[PDB]
């Protein structure tokens, strides 16, 4: 527990940005990326119009303000459902704002802040991790 979610956090991060298959995850850390991914894709497809909320202005400088968007998650309700946006966002920026085939300095911004937030946002303790 603790930073274990970091290595796994980048998994879904790179796994979506096609990076010759990130070779830095446990035998089980791979499956997690599969399950979480299912929720990420479904969240993007289902929740699309609702994204009008504030999924633009903040994504303009997410490189200098990546975690700034993760603050919305822990504003009132940090339920699993609302947490999905955390990982889901990584797929929205990795497949729209950040071209795949390379983990350019950009993609890192996501993982660099993703965990930096998730960490202080240790909510992961409840994040879908039971199956």
Curated annotation (Swiss-Prot):
GO terms for cellular component: host cell cytoplasm. The chain holds residues 6 to 136 of 171 of the full protein. Its main location: host cell. GO terms for biological process: regulation of apoptotic process; symbiont-mediated suppression of host apoptosis; symbiont-mediated suppression of host autophagy. Plays a role in the protection against apoptosis mediated by cytotoxic cells during the immune response to acute and persistent viral infection. Contributes therefore to latency establishment. Plays also a role in the inhibition of host starvation-induced autophagy which ultimately contributes to the viral chronic infection. It is found in: Host cytoplasm. The lineage of its organism: Viruses, Duplodnaviria, Heunggongvirae, Peploviricota, Herviviricetes. This is Apoptosis regulator Bcl-2 homolog. Keywords: Disulfide bond, Host cytoplasm, Host-virus interaction, Inhibition of host apoptosis by viral BCL2-like protein, Inhibition of host autophagy by virus, Modulation of host cell apoptosis by virus. It comes from Murid herpesvirus 4 (MuHV-4). Signal peptide: none annotated. Interacts with host BECN1; this interaction inhibits host autophagy. Interacts with host BAK1 and BAX. The keyword Iron does not apply.
């Amino acid at each position: 527990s603790g930073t274990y979610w970091a290595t796994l956090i980048t998994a879904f991060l790179k796994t979506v940005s096609k990076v010759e298959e990130l070779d830095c995850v446990d035998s089980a850390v791979l499956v997690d990326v599969s399950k979480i991914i299912t929720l990420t894709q479904e969240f993007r497809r289902h929740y699309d119009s609702v994204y009008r909320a504030d999924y633009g202005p903040a994504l303009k400088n997410w490189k200098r303000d990546l975690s700034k968007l993760f603050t919305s998650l822990f504003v009132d309700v940090i339920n699993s459902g609302r947490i999905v946006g955390f990982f889901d966002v990584g797929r929205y920026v990795c497949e729209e704002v950040l071209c795949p085939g390379s983990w350019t300095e950009d993609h890192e911004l996501l993982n660099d802040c993703m965990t930096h937030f998730f960490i202080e946002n240790n909510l992961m303790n409840h994040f879908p991790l039971e199956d």
